[PDB]
Design an enzyme around this catalytic site. Structure first.
Site, short mmCIF file in Angstrom:
data_model
loop_
_atom_site.label_atom_id
_atom_site.label_comp_id
_atom_site.label_asym_id
_atom_site.label_seq_id
_atom_site.Cartn_x
_atom_site.Cartn_y
_atom_site.Cartn_z
N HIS A 109 -20.83 -20.25 33.38
CA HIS A 109 -20.94 -18.85 33.75
C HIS A 109 -20.75 -17.93 32.54
CE1 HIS A 109 -16.41 -18.81 34.39
NE2 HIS A 109 -16.59 -17.57 33.96
N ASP A 165 -19.64 -26.09 36.50
CA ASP A 165 -19.46 -24.90 35.64
C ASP A 165 -19.13 -25.41 34.23
OD1 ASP A 165 -19.28 -22.33 34.76
OD2 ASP A 165 -17.42 -21.84 35.79
N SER A 180 -11.89 -18.22 30.80
CA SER A 180 -12.93 -19.17 31.22
C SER A 180 -13.53 -19.88 30.02
CB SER A 180 -14.05 -18.47 31.97
OG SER A 180 -13.53 -17.83 33.12
#
Ligand SMILES: C[C@H](CCC(=O)NCCC[N+](C)(C)CCCS(=O)(=O)[O-])[C@H]1CC[C@H]2[C@@H]3[C@H](O)C[C@@H]4C[C@H](O)CC[C@]4(C)[C@H]3C[C@H](O)[C@]12C
EC number: 3.4.21.39
Lengths: 61, 226
Positions: B45, B89, B182
């Site tokens: 992402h 992801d 992230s």
């Protein structure tokens, strides 16, 4: 083709997602991966994140 | 990182600070980690039109001699990545050049497929992300120790799959990875087991991490061909 508007208010539950108000505009950045969400940038906040396709529509629709 | 401490500068030399651009508008930022001299692992992402990686950093606002700032030349996003579930992801980034191995810049071993890490053990994650829901990103690299939780603790995340994902952070505490972290690695007893993927907007743990071991075949396939 990438300029969209929120049809409803939305409060995000995942930190990857934007929260927004009805009438907020977005530039769609990536809609290639499958899923309920597209990556977008808010023109109001300048923040980037996912928005749910069923909350938005093109500005000219 | 919420509830963490400042890292000893350069003590996590595989850490990568990613700046992600898409034409004219403001950039976004993620973590990542160096797994080969010219490959960085991060979250899917975090993809964008162009990406710059900074290696050797501590305070990301203060250029120093340890910095190696490299452009990404190719992005390899996992082909099954899906935005509803955020399954898979994970993404590899090929750098324009091989990084120089120095005390401040090094690679992090990634696990064999069999090395499957279990609930109750404590792991560590680092990043430059926000230190609270309404707090700034951190100029300095931060780290926190978090408990690996049973998958049931992540039942409220859409289609949480224990084969693909780790459930990280005791919900009774506020300590957590958060926005801007992230792509950063989760290390368990010094071994890389997870990648920060996503969690709650309100920062209530646990958060979801990509389980690296599941992806070792895919990682090998990308590294072998590139
Ligand atoms: C498939 C589309 C159409 C559905 C799926 C979820 C729906 C929204 C949520 O239900 C929350 C909220 C309830 C209110 O009542 C009316 C407004 C609002 C924003 C709904 C509008 C609309 O109906 C949505 C977008």
């Amino acid at each position: 083709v990438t300029l969209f508007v929120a049809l409803y208010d939305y409060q995000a539950d995942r930190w990857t997602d934007l929260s927004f108000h009805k009438g907020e505009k977005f530039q769609i950045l990536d809609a290639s991966p499958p899923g309920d969400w597209w990556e977008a940038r808010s023109l109001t906040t300048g923040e980037t994140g996912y928005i749910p396709s069923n909350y938005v529509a093109p500005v000219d629709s | 990182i919420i509830g963490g401490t400042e890292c000893k500068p350069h003590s996590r030399p595989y850490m990568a600070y990613l700046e992600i651009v898409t034409s004219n508008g403001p950039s976004k930022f993620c973590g990542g980690f160096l797994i080969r001299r010219n490959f960085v692992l991060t979250a899917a992402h975090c993809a964008g039109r162009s990406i710059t990686v900074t290696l050797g950093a501590h305070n990301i606002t203060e250029e120093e001699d340890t910095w190696q700032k490299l452009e990404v030349i190719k992005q390899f996003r996992h082909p099954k990545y899906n935005t509803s579930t955020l399954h898979h992801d994970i993404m590899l980034l090929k750098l324009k050049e091989k990084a120089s191995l120095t005390l401040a810049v090094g690679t992090l071993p990634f696990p064999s497929q069999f090395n499957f890490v279990p609930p109750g053990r404590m792991c560590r994650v680092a990043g430059w992300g926000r230190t609270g829901v309404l707090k700034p990103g951190s100029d300095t690299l931060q780290e926190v120790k978090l408990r690996l939780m049973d998958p049931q603790a992540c039942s409220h995340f859409r289609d949480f799959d224990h084969n693909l994902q780790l459930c990280v952070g005791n919900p009774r505490k506020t300590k957590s990875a958060f926005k801007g972290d992230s792509g950063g690695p989760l290390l368990c007893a010094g071994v890389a087991q997870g990648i920060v993927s996503y969690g709650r907007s309100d920062a209530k743990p646990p958060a979801v991490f990509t389980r690296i071991s599941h992806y070792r075949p895919w990682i090998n396939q990308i590294l072998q061909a590139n």
